Amino acid sequence: VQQLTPAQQAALRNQQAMAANLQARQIVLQQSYPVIQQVETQTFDPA
Amino acid sequence: MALINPQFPYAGPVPIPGPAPTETMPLLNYRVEGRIAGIQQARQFMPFLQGPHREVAEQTYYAIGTGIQMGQTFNQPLINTQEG
Description:
It is classed as virus. This is part of a larger assembly, with chains A and B. Helix content of chain A is about 55%, strand content about 0%. Chain A has two helices and no strands. The longest helix of chain A is centred in the middle third of the chain and has 17 residues, at about 15-30. In chain A, about 0% of the residues are buried.
């Protein structure tokens, strides 16, 4: 009959936390804004 | 749904060499406790305003008054002595 691996048994006991993780990622990516910004610049001699 | 060959039948599976039986059994992976690190700030200096905007601009008004209204020197008509 059907036998689940220990990886698939863990995926059924964590399936409501994964549904809440997916719908929180969709809210973040919809309502935030991507920014790229310079944080550090330096010029050195490696000797 | 294969058809049995009656002239050349075969039997069930025989034992064969195996893949060292404990090496097909995994460990159960042992999670430690974790923490979203740091003390979070309450507010963020956002690059966009969070309120509504207006598509069109509407002209606004304010009331003003005129001034003290004076009298006038009218040009006055002639007398209707049956010519008019």
